[PDB]
Design a protein around this ligand. Structure first.
Ligand SMILES: O=C(O)c1ccc(P(=O)(O)OCCO)cc1
Ligand SMILES: [Ca+2]
Length: 258
């Protein structure tokens, strides 16, 4: 596997606040075409090969600040992280899906050479919080060539996603009453194709805003899903299959083995 980056993982090494790669950043003007700009976090070491990329969208009326902690956390494990702002703070889930693809296209076509030369433009993912999570599902319908999708406590009015072809990892919050898992996160996951590689993780006692503050249980398995599907790295299947039993997890569902 030519996309394998970093040493062989352990349960502690995926919980590490800093991975094996150092992080540099680039700021992108809000007048970039198709999205509201953002901050790119990328690994600085080039001697192991180029990296895949994930665009990170925020929720309704939120900004990249609410998703900022993913930046260094994930990119230090060998990914290019693009925390973006939306065109307006009121953008709908469909609008946030189009803007996630616009951010990924900016990385490929127009990003700074320091970023371009570290990027594998064929290995791209999407991630989003709340309405940005509903945008992550919309992004995979709009671009089924993406490698992974991670809706965090997602909110969407449309509950059926039976045509999704991108490995999707949904994270729900037990005490979410803004996008309750019983009418949002769980219906989305169960509607995903039975054959798709997918997973659902419900955090115990978590609120709708748990993705906005550093969370090891979120971090360790966001990194595992991204390595497993953006890097095709089967060294991270051990963490995902069989289903994790972390004390922080109150409900886990998957289509293991993968
Ligand atoms: O209008 C509603 O009912 C409504 C429902 C959910 C959201 P959200 O994107 O999950 O909020 C999280 C942003 O930090 C916004 C509005
Ligand atoms: Ca713009």
């Amino acid at each position: 596997n030519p996309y394998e980056r970093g040493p062989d993982p352990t349960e502690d090494s995926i919980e590490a606040i800093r991975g094996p790669f150092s992080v540099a950043t680039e700021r992108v003007s809000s007048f970039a075409s198709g999205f509201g700009g953002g901050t790119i976090y990328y690994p600085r070491e080039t001697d192991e090969g180029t990296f895949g990329a994930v665009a990170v969208a925020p929720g309704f009326t939120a900004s990249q600040g609410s998703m900022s902690w993913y930046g260094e956390r994930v990119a230090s494990h060998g990914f290019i992280v693009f925390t973006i702002d939306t065109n307006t703070r009121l953008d709908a889930p469909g609008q946030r899906g189009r803007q996630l693809l616009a951010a990924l296209d900016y990385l490929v076509e127009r990003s700074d050479r320091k970023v371009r030369e570290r990027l594998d433009p064929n290995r791209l993912a999407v991630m989003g919080h709340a309405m940005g999570g509903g945008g992550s599902l919309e992004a995979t319908v709009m671009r089924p060539s993406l490698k992974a999708s991670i809706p965090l406590t997602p909110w969407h009015l449309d509950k059926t996603w039976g045509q999704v072809q991108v490995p999707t990892f949904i994270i729900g919050a037990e005490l979410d009453t803004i996008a309750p898992v019983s009418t949002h996160a769980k219906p989305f996951y169960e509607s995903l194709p039975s054959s798709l590689p997918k997973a659902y993780m419900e955090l115990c006692g978590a609120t709708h805003f748990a993705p906005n503050i550093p969370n090891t249980t979120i971090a360790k398995y966001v990194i595992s899903w991204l390595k497993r599907f953006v890097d095709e790295d089967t060294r991270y299947s051990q963490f995902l299959c069989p289903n994790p039993t972390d004390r922080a997890i109150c409900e886990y569902r998957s289509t293991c083995p993968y």
